[PDB]
Design a binder for this molecule. Structure first.
Ligand SMILES: *[C@@H]1O[C@H](CO)[C@@H](O)[C@H](O)[C@H]1NC(C)=O
Ligand SMILES: *[C@@H]1O[C@H](CO)[C@@H](O)[C@H](O)[C@H]1NC(C)=O
Lengths: 48, 49, 97, 48, 49
């Protein structure tokens, strides 16, 4: 966390700094998107 | 016109020779997206000036 | 799915769901089986790097000369009538003798 | 045209002019004849 | 660059996946024509303003 990494999370390839988000996702909600529609946040498939 | 907007998605799906065809569509569209912005900004700057 | 003894006919085709498992497609190239393997939508080599959510393999049997007429947008006595593929469909073509 | 007994050689090729008639191309899909059938210029199903 | 400049001609000839390739040639040329028009109109209006 808190470091720039090139990551692939549940078949989603991206590069960014991973930080713990205070937003509350619904159980089905996984991949979040910003105004630009680029991925804002994801959910760890191993330990949710 | 490309399959997907994400570059990391196209690079993860199509062949390197195949991805260059669809990436060519995004860049050309993003150039026109940037050219349209710069063109307006150059024109809006003349309005501000 | 691929190695099954007798597939369902192309007239009535069985839909085999693939979910909650680990799909290694390098096994296809490890031992020689499939004669004709081509992926229109993705890369055969990147199938192990990037993975897919819901995989549905539709098995059937068609005449040999129609392997070139089965593809998105292609036409034929099968594609135009019995079994058709979407024009935007992304997938792979798997065939063997 | 299609089911003619003997076509001319490719050396001197026959030019068959088809006009003032009704062409139903669904017959080609009715019985299997052509081994390789493809249309580069237009769609084969849109021929009718 | 398309086979024809009429949409009804391309849709009635090439496949829907094949028509999108040629329609992409029209719209790209029609966007560049419309963007150039809007570019001039913004510049011509700056002369009028
Ligand atoms: C495995 O996955 C499950 C469910 O996502 C998770 O609860 C568990 O912590 C993961 N790790 C192990 C070793 O089970
Ligand atoms: C199918 O399974 C049989 C029995 O395990 C094996 O002998 C054969 O090599 C397999 N063939 C293919 C195409 O995987």
């Amino acid at each position: 966390k808190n470091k720039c990494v090139n990551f692939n999370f549940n078949g989603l390839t991206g590069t960014g700094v991973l930080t713990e988000s205070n937003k509350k996702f619904l159980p089905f909600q996984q991949f979040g998107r910003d105004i630009a529609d680029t991925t804002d946040a994801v959910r760890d498939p191993q330990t949710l | 016109g490309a399959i997907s907007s994400v570059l990391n998605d196209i690079l993860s799906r199509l062949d390197p020779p195949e991805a260059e065809v669809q990436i060519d569509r995004l860049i050309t569209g993003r150039l026109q997206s940037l050219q349209t912005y710069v063109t307006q900004q150059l024109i809006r700057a003349a309005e501000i000036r | 799915v691929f190695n099954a003894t007798r597939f369902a006919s192309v007239y009535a085709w069985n839909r085999k769901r693939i979910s909650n498992c680990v799909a290694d497609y390098s096994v296809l190239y490890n031992s020689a089986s499939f004669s004709t393997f081509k992926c229109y939508g993705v890369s055969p080599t990147k199938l192990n790097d990037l993975c897919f959510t819901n995989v549905y393999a539709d098995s059937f049997v068609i005449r040999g000369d129609e392997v070139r007429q089965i593809a998105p947008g292609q036409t034929g006595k099968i594609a135009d009538y019995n079994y058709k593929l979407p024009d935007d469909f992304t997938g792979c073509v798997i065939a063997w003798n």
